[PDB]
């Protein structure tokens with residue numbers, strides 16, 4: 238009987254520090270916007286230049302923010318370069334050099350009076366975070382017992398939302414979000430990197446990686462027994478040997494081959510679509526602009542409403558954690574897509590009617606908080622770990638590179654295109670997100686298999702069975 242040992246908890250918690258990194262760096266940038274723009278202005282005039290226009294300031298601000306996404310796009314797509322070469326554990330250890338570097342560029346850019354270092358810092362930390370968003374579910378997916386793969390997979394998203402919450406709190410200007418201390422707000426990302434790097438050598442390599450990739454059955458078997466607290470891992474070892482046998486009969490998997498081979502096309506389209514369902518839900522937009530929408534809905538101090546949204550963000554991630562093995566992935570993902578379709582619709586109605594009818598403002602405030610709760614029930618955590626369950630050992634790294642890249646890329650696209658669309662459509666802009674949510678609800682119901690409690694082998698065989 239398999240058990241959740243302290244060893245297993247340790248290995249997984251240490252992995253999700255990378256999750257916390259993604260969450261922190263993603264969210265930290267919003268609060269000090271004015272402070273950093275003032276920094277950008279003061280830097281330019283401290284050299285031999287006129288004060289920047291609003292246009293140049295915006296453009297330099299936008300760049301500081303967006304280059305992080307560009308880094309994440311490149312990093313997440315590059316994961317395949319690391320995990321087969323160095324293994325899963327060592328890849329995580331290695332890439333913390335990017336985290337310390339990017340963090341020091343950001344922490345020093347003010348005293349160095351360099352807008353360039355700020356941008357470079359964001360790009361490097363973006364690269365690190367992209368590699369992480371791929372590394373962590375792959376490691377967690379490969380060391381969790383099958384019966385708890387989904388629950389442990391949800392610890393990845395939990396670290397992310399705790400990352401975001403902490404960045405919001407630190408961003409308070411009586412904490413680190415001031416004119417003098419914002420370099421530390423940004424450079425804080427250094428500290429978790431150092432902590433994780435210290436603990437990582439004591440975490441095990443993936444036994445799946447050791448047995449299947451590196452053909453070290455007796456080492457793998459010994460990891461498994463300690464990690465799960467049982468001598469009897471015969472079935473798990475045998476499933477891995479089956480996977481080893483199939484990987485030996487197939488060519489090395491490339492990214493392109495995923496779309497060529499029938500058996501891989503179905504799971505990769507599912508994988509990519511589910512990332513879109515995460516990002517084309519409007520979560521970027523909703524979180525970023527929630528403060529402005531709270532304020533126009535009358536919230537006297539809208540920062541605290543936003544931190545309140547971050548807390549809701551965390552609570553319902555934990556709710557999902559406890560339901561995903563009982564409800565299954567399909568159910569949790571559809572409920573969350575459905576609920577969000579309802580809330581985004583309600584945001585449009587509220588905003589349209591707010592100036593004519595009384596409490597529609599409060600309904601607007603509610604719609605946003607309930608949106609975030611439905612987002613974390615399913616579309617938040619599930620897309621990040623489910624790709625790991627849709628493939629066996631051979632295709633997984635290339636598959637996760639592709640799916641993770643599509644997550645970052647579509648997130649980038651939401652950030653890029655939403656202000657234009659909001660400009661033209663106003664309150665109706667949330668009906669665009671509603672449309673995607675409904676489309677992806679239908680896709681999920683019809684196309685996404687239940688993965689709960691199934692071995693990779695079983696899941697892969699069913700895909701091969703359809704392709705015939």
Ligand SMILES: OC[C@H]1O[C@H](O[C@H]2[C@H](O)[C@@H](O)[C@@H](O)O[C@@H]2CO)[C@H](O)[C@@H](O)[C@@H]1O
Pocket residue numbers: 263264267394397398401515520521522524525550617648
């Ligand atoms: O502004 C904070 C942050 O919120 C959203 O972050 C998402 C993330 O993109 C998803 O992959 C998933 O992990 O859930 C997070 C929210 O808990 C925005 O998409 C992101 O751009 C934004 O910075």
